[PDB]
Structure 1
Amino acid sequence: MLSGLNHLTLAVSQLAPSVAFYQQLLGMTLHARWDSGAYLSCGDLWLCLSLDPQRRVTPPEESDYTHYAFSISEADFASFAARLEAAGVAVWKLNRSEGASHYFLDPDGHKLELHVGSLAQRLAACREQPYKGMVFF
């Protein structure tokens, strides 16, 4: 059967600024870079950045809610979010509708998130403060 996410590939319009964002600003590990892409890791996540002439820099009001959240500890969350804010990283959402999260944009407008907590923890929180109509299986 399917066993998890093998990799996440993000189309990017300019390779160098995107590599710098994920490696320098977000602290991911850069393994390789070539004329049209890069491979990074974030813990177990394999991230590919793929140079794509079709990628547009997209304002958040023009894209749907599809987004990619990265795990961070409770101890590190606030200072990492504040560092992104001080660096001028654009945002796309303020209301914490799914727990402790910071919502920010990559250089092409990919919707990213820092989140504290697992799925199990989110289900437990939702039992007390459920989303409208929620059923648990």
Structure 2
Amino acid sequence: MLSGLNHLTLAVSQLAPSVAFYQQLLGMTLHARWDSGAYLSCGDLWLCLSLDPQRRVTPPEESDYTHYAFSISEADFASFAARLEAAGVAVWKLNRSEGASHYFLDPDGHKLELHVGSLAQRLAACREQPYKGMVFF
């Protein structure tokens, strides 16, 4: 059967600024780059940045809610979010509707998130403060 996420591939319009964002600003590990892409890891996540002439820099009001959240500890969350803020990283959401999260945009407008907590913890929180109509299996 399917066993998890093998890799996340993001189309990027300019490779070097995107590599710098994920490696320098977000602290991900850069393993290789070539004329048309790069391979990074974030813990167990395999991230591929793929230079795509079709990728547009997309304002957050023009894209849907599809987004990618990265795990961070409770101890590191606030200072990492504040550092992104001080660095001028654009945002896309302010209301914490799914726990402790910071919502920010990559250079092409990919919707990203820092989040503290697992699925199990989110389900436990939702049992006390459920979303409308919520059923647990």
Which of the five TM-score ranges fits, normalised by the shorter chain? Answer: over 0.9
Structure 2 match to 1:54: 54
Q: Distance in 2 between matches of 1:35 and 1:41?
A: 19
| Displacement over 6 Å in runs of 4+ | none
Q: Distance in 2 between matches of 1:131 and 1:113?
A: 20
The answer for unaligned runs of 5 or more in structure 2 is none
Q: Deviations over 1:11-37 (max 9, x none)?
A: 000000000000000000000000000
Q: What is the CA-CA distance between 1:44 and the residue it aligns to?
A: 0.1
Q: Deviations over 1:42-85 (max 9, x none)?
A: 00000000000000000000000000000000000000000000
Q: What is the CA-CA distance between 1:113 and the residue it aligns to?
A: 0.0
Q: Distance in 1 between matches of 2:132 and 2:38?
A: 41
TM-score by length of 2: 1.00
Structure 2 match to 1:88: 88
Cα root mean square deviation, aligned: 0.1
Q: What is the CA-CA distance between 1:122 and the residue it aligns to?
A: 0.0
Identity %: 100
Count matched residues: 137
Q: Deviations over 1:67-114 (max 9, x none)?
A: 000000000000000000000000000000000000000000000000
TM-score by length of 1: 1.00
Q: Distance in 1 between matches of 2:61 and 2:47?
A: 25
